[PDB]
Amino acid sequence: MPAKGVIQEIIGVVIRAKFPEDEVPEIYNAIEIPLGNGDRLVCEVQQQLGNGVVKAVAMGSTDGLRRGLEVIDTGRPIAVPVGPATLGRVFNVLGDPIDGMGPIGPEVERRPIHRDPPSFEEQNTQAQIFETGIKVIDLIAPFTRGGKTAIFGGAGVGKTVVIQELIANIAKEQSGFSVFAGVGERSREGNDLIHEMKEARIDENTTVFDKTVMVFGQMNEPPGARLRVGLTALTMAEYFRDEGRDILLFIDNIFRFVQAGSEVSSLLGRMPSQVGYQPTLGTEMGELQERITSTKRGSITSMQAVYVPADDYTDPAPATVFSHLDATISLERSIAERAIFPAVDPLASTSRILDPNIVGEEHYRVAQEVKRVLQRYKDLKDIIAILGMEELSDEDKLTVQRARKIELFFSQPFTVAQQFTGRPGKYVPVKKTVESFARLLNGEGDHIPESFFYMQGDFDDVLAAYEASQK
């Protein structure tokens, strides 16, 4: 479809292009406006308003465009490069590398942004745990293969730190790739800091950055770009999924994807729905998070970060996000103030895979009893702070001691990210977490003071440090 049209209307980041009566571009067909030299503006067709007129979102500056400019139809949605050539590179919404390196090249396979999800036959009937290395994540709210996990928290609780240490864990300890979709990524927070963090984490002769793809829909971009960056990262990850690999896509803020969709719908003149949101919120979430599944060939596990507006979990954006979630990891500022870097609240982190018949019979006894002990501590904390531990009877003093031990034991140094409290790499497996927490839950740790459990290992590091200090 080499059809050439002309720009008819320009209203903000929403343009209209008049084409011939035949060969009109389809919906999501990525028209392109040359701007001189090699620069071009890639718009995405959203509506067909009659005789050859298509309404599209700019996905670019569109601040120097005149009416009547030539527009080239591409005949397909936005084409982004896929393959090993995308590893170690940073892309915008259009798949153009926004790092210092040059273009990808014409010999690299390009794929459309808008694909269909895996069919009904391709879905995996039986779920499977995804080991991630983190103690609290693998124990309390375990991941699922081809599933969605959402991390919550405040502005500075450490969600991005958790995301990047998970990227490092996936890249270094196992030979697996990951794709990071920085939707609404600040040009300071992610466009240099995350690159430095990924290029600082090194295993041998290569970095964690070398085993991950990055697609940055920065905040300065128009709402269409921040809307389509998630699908761009999905397209770049589905290649490795088609090779049978287990990709773990990360999403910087799925709420900013929702807000980009709402802004795009408002700019197109559509009637608002719910709390001023787009009418197509459910379908827009489905077209993204139904491509994150466990195919019979390969799998895409995903980890989103969700911003909850006004701490309202019944808000339509968290309501629609929660419909697709398989696990939740709640970060609390209170835990962060106690110098706990993995500030995961085990009493607020859930997972659908936490079942006796999937993650193990001992898993859904150790996790259940750990949660019960922590709930007992949460109940008794006010009494302890007001009165003191002397009022607590037996079976409650021991419970509080074990609860403090596990609460301080959930902390990890994230030695892969920088070298803060650096120590030999552990990457504690799921079975090791189960065995350590069953060990402490069955006593065997009461002689340890409640200060050794800090950035520790697998409860064998705890006893090793106890023997080293004084034994």
Binding site: Q8, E9, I10, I11, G12, V13, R16, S61, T62, D63, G64, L65, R66, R67, G68, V90, I98, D99, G100, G154, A155, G156, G184, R186, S187, R188, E189, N191, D192, L193, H195, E196, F216, Q218, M219, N220, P222, P223, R256, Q259, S262, E263, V264, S265, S266, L267, L268, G269, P272, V275, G276, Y307, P309, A310, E337
Partner: protein
């Protein structure tokens, strides 16, 4: 030869054979409808989006009122009038200037109050300049930036110790009604007297009297030697208020990329304050609704998160490859009854790196900077602090968090045990320490010394209502009896192990000498 011969040699080239006397069919537009600051033009097909149009002078009007061609609809150009809408009439000629909006930039704008178009309004003569920078440009990008390391010293102990602001960091100041947001911004501007940083103040949608008072405050403290005051007041059209912060940040990006000679030193660091982004968003909402663009939540247009983001993502910290300069943004947001979850507040909060929350409850309770430490964050953190402040303010942050956990027991402290009463008294003394008078910023050495005195057990003897006075007196002591202690603290403020025995012993001796010779 004479220099006038060189002057004539410059002439007699364009004078004789340098002018093209060719008449050409230039495409102009005719006005078909004038609204409430929006004029629609029939045919102007040689116009780009956001291009400044002229409206050339006509009978009874000896000046041209420019506009901004925003809606390039099919056979229609809706342009928002920058000046006054009364003079524009149906059938008026409109000539496309062929240019996007640009503002004069450079050394000449230093101490000048200017329009968003760059025209001076201070009445101090024309702006001297040789370069114009475009209003709208893309942010520096991905590889251009650098991690924020250099601190911006606002002079407020609470901000500089708990909510660090670094060069290249977008730190929102969000408050409500009269809580001192402009006071905090002006205090930050006044503290850059010799810090090698050029300040810019935008003042979108304010009073002419308020901007005049701000300029008078700046020029009575000598701050206009390095400050640029853009001004789009309340009476001015919504187009000027819409383009004011972009003009300010264009000047700031000129400072960042090239730099200016300030005090004989090249300065490439700029601190910009958008004193009302809520008013800027209101002005752009008026522009969009008068253009009949489809509204969204709270009647704001769809591209209102985009609006501010273009403005705020231009504040960067460039690496040494791209000059090493920086632009620091201090947006100001006014909430309504502390409605943090409103549209524009959430937009700016998500965009900006950190937030500074000002509460009316603290303002009316005597807290002179009405800063809410509990909810306000700076995600850059310790990287935007000196090593001295990093070493000292950690215990201050911990003690203040402990006090905020126990704030309900403050009036009951006489009936509690020893440790809880001690924590409450320490928190009360620290909160009284953070109270600062207006227009009195403190240097980093003074803040470090005061916070070291407070962090260690030295303010326990002096009662709470005198803590502030103690601080003032101590500073006077350090300003008169021991300048060497202040110089020593300032000299090794970048040392990784800041409390070296030399500076530690000097500071302890100064504190003991002050306490022994003073009574409270």
């Amino acid at each position: 030869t004479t220099i006038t011969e060189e002057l004539i040699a410059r002439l007699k080239q364009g004078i004789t054979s340098g002018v093209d006397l060719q008449p050409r069919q230039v495409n102009v537009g005719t006005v078909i409808a004038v609204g409430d600051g929006v004029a629609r033009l029939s045919g102007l097909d040689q116009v780009v989006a956001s291009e400044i149009v002229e409206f050339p002078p006509k009978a009874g009007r000896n000046e041209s009122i420019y506009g901004i061609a925003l809606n390039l609809e099919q056979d229609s150009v809706a342009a928002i009038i920058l000046g006054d809408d009364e003079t524009i009439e149906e059938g008026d000629m409109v000539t496309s200037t062929g240019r996007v909006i640009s503002v004069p930039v450079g050394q000449g704008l230093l101490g000048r109050v200017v329009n968003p178009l760059g025209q001076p309004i201070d009445g101090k003569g024309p702006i001297v300049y040789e370069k114009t920078r475009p209003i709208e440009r893309i942010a520096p990008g991905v590889i251009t930036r650098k991690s924020v390391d250099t601190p911006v010293q606002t002079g407020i102990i609470a901000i500089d110790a708990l909510i660090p602001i670094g060069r290249g960091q977008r730190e929102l100041i969000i408050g409500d009604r009269q809580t001192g947001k402009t006071a905090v911004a002006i205090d930050t501007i006044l503290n850059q007297k010799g810090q090698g940083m050029v300040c810019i103040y935008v003042a979108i949608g304010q009073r002419r009297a308020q901007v005049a008072q701000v300029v008078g405050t700046l020029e009575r403290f000598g701050a206009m030697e390095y400050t640029i005051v853009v001004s789009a007041t309340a009476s001015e059209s919504a187009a000027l208020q819409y383009i004011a912060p972009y003009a300010g940040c264009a000047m700031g990006e000129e400072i960042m990329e090239n730099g200016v000679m300030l005090n004989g030193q090249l300065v490439k660091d700029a601190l910009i304050v958008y004193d009302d982004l809520s008013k800027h968003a209101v002005a752009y909402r008026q522009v969009s609704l008068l253009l009949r663009r489809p509204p969204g939540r709270e009647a704001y247009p769809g591209d209102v998160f985009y609006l501010h983001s273009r403005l705020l993502e231009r504040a960067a910290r460039l690496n040494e490859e791209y000059g090493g300069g920086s632009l620091t943004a201090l947006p100001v947001i006014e909430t309504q009854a502390n409605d943090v979850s409103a549209y524009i507040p959430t937009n700016v909060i998500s965009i900006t790196d950190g937030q500074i929350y000002l509460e009316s409850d603290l303002f009316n309770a005597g807290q002179r900077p009405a800063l809410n430490v509990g909810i306000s964050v700076s995600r850059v953190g310790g990287a935007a602090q000196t090593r001295a402040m990093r070493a000292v303010a950690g215990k201050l942050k911990g003690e203040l968090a402990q006090f905020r956990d126990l704030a309900a027991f403050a009036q009951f402290a006489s009936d509690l045990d020893a440790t809880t009463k001690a924590q409450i008294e320490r928190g009360q003394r620290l909160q009284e320490l953070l109270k600062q008078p207006q227009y009195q910023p403190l240097p980093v050495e003074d803040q470090v010394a005061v916070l070291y005195a407070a962090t260690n057990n030295y303010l326990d003897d002096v009662p709470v209502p005198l803590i502030t006075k103690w601080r003032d007196d101590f500073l006077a002591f350090l300003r008169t009896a021991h300048p060497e202690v202040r110089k020593l603290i300032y000299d090794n403020r970048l040392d990784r192990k800041f409390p070296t025995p030399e500076v530690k012993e000097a500071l302890e001796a100064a504190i003991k000498e002050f306490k022994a010779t003073s009574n409270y």
